[PDB]
Design a protein around this nucleic acid. Structure first.
Lengths: 489, 71
DNA sequence: GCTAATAAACTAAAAACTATTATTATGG
DNA sequence: CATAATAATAGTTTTTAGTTTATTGGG
């Protein structure tokens, strides 16, 4: 499902950004600004399909297209970008706070119902596929129901409308964190993470819409609608958009075939593919090439059933893809596959096929790991019910080794090193790998997008150490390595 | 390497199984016996890598020996 | 005494995400 | 020939597919 996650950033202007309010820090203006800046950076690196707008409930002198009193409209709904980063840097730090004092000032009178009015206007402004719409708000004023009851009633009515409209609002601890003490009564219409928001984890791109769906033409009679998808991706280099080094102007690199001799623009027609082999240049053509690659229609033709016992580590290829059952023109796909999964204890003998990716391209043997409905107790469908597309190699997929068959050592070595490795058991964490080049690259991009003094080099969990395992375990591994002249040359 | 072959799994169309070598010409049988008392002494790498039989040199690229160099 | 065998990067790339317009059916 | 007919034939940014890029190499 495509859709722009619109997010609004409601930050106070009177004191909730400026009063300690049962705390001792500085004005929450600066911390809130840095928090939202961090999340903007996180989106820029991780999500540029989500619109953002910042609003200041409370305004001495209105900066608002709505022109309503106590409305300060800084940034309109739009995807994250550098102009907004500069916009917030104007109000970043205590220098930014005193700026805020300069053009409009703090202690600003508020208009809550009008704030809901104008943010509703902003939500109405969008013209695109919307995935989510959230109001993000911090306030030291956890319960300013001390206002006129008419304003509170109208604000609650507007909240009922907007959540009825589907608009979502978030107020999160700024005065009395934890214990539900925060929002002493503004809990009425709203029903921690500052560390994450400042942490601004980024560079996370994920599937948004369905793609690459096919059918299980298992025999010449039966087909079963399915869909092929990925969750393991190879991180790319971001596109080098050739810009004029002076004027930042893009490049129309006009690349074509041609003739080195007669100065004419050649075409694939008046040219032919060829293969210089032996004594014969083996000629071909573009459609000839396609046909030589054109084998059969895309889909899954069942070639057999193999137990999940022949599969071994050497039986491995490119990272596996996934198949989910689909019912667009094959009734019972999901039903029959549910039967397959319930009888998957016996269906360790998984399906065998020579999968054809698309037309004009050949099929290839790819095994299918039966994915169960592994729904977690917290209701996370890890490995959704389907099949993992582990790819069956050919004799092509081989680069042989020598055969200097090595023999086992004395069992005391095995036992002592088992004690070593289990004593030196690294805490398992699947979501623990970030590429230092990748991370440092993100940091260069974000830092050399502003005038940052330096891009930080992210010390990743992927970096091995020298003493952390040498204090969790110690040098007893080397002392155990009792053989003369250990591989520590 | 005899003109004929020397001396579900049914998916479709494998290589040739074999070819007669016993009921063949008696002269062929005599020559085969002499070259086989040779074979027990010399069966050759030409056959050790793959015994040349008219059955087994038909279907696929088994001769092409699909493989690349070592790393 | 010599001289690849690679593999960082190639430089790309075929995927429906979306669908208005024509569809030629029926008021005219 | 009548004249608002309202389906397919793409429009889309898709990630993801083969790109020479690279150095140890026989003397």
């Amino acid at each position: 499902y495509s859709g722009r996650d619109s997010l609004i950033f409601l930050v106070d202007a009177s004191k909730a950004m400026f009063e300690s309010q049962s705390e001792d820090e500085l004005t929450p203006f600066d911390m809130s600004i840095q928090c939202i800046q961090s999340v903007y950076i996180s989106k820029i690196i991780s999500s540029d399909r989500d619109l953002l707008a910042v609003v200041f409930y409370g305004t001495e002198k209105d900066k608002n297209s709505v022109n309503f009193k106590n409305i300060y409209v800084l940034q309109e709904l739009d995807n994250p970008g550098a102009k907004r980063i500069l916009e917030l840097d104007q109000f970043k730090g205590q220098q930014g706070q005193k700026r805020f004092q300069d053009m409009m000032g703090h202690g600003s009178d508020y208009s809550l119902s009008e704030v809901l009015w104008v943010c509703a206007n902003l939500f109405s402004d969008v013209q695109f596929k919307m995935s989510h719409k959230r109001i993000m708000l911090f306030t030291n004023e956890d319960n300013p129901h001390g206002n006129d009851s008419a304003k509170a009633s109208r604000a609650r009515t507007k909240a009922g409308d907007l959540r009825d409209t589907g608009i979502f609002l978030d107020l999160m601890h700024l005065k009395k964190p934890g214990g539900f003490d925060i929002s002493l009564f503004y809990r009425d219409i709203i029903s921690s993470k500052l560390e994450d928001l400042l942490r601004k984890v980024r560079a996370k791109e994920t599937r948004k819409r369905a793609l690459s769906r096919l059918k299980l033409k298992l025999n010449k009679d039966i087909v079963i609608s399915v869909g092929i998808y990925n969750l393991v991706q190879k991180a790319l280099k971001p596109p080098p958009i050739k810009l004029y080094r002076e004027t930042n102007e893009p490049v129309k690199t006009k690349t074509r075939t041609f003739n080195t001799s007669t100065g004419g623009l050649l075409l694939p027609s008046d040219t032919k593919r060829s293969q210089i082999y032996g004594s014969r240049q083996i000629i071909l053509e573009k459609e000839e090439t396609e046909e030589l690659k054109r084998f059969d229609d895309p889909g899954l033709m069942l070639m057999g059933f193999k137990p999940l016992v022949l599969l071994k580590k050497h039986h491995y290829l490119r990272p596996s893809l996934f198949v989910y059952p689909e019912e667009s023109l094959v009734i019972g796909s999901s039903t029959l596959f549910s039967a397959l999964l319930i009888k998957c204890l016996e269906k360790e003998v998984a399906a065998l096929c020579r999968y054809t990716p698309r037309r004009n391209i050949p099929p290839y043997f790819v095994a299918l790991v039966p994915q169960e409905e592994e729904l977690d107790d917290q209701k996370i469908q890890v490995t959704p019910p389907g099949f993992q597309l582990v790819f069956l190699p050919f004799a092509d997929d081989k680069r042989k080794m020598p055969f200097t068959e090595k023999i086992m050592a004395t069992p005391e070595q095995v036992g002592k090193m088992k004690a070593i490795v289990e004593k030196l058991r690294f805490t398992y964490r699947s979501d623990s790998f970030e590429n230092p080049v990748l991370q440092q690259h993100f940091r260069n991009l974000e830092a050399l997008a502003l005038d940052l003094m330096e891009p930080e080099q992210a010390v990743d969990l992927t970096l091995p150490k020298v003493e952390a395992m040498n204090k969790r375990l110690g040098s007893l591994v080397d002392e155990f390595k009792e053989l003369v002249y250990p591989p520590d040359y | 390497f005899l003109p004929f072959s020397l001396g579900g799994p049914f998916r479709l169309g494998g290589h040739g199984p074999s070819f007669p070598l016993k009921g063949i010409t008696e002269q062929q049988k005599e020559g085969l016996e002499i070259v086989k008392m040779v074979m027990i002494s010399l069966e050759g790498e030409d056959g050790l890598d793959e015994i040349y039989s008219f059955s087994e040199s038909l279907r696929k690229l088994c001769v092409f020996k699909k493989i690349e160099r070592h790393s």
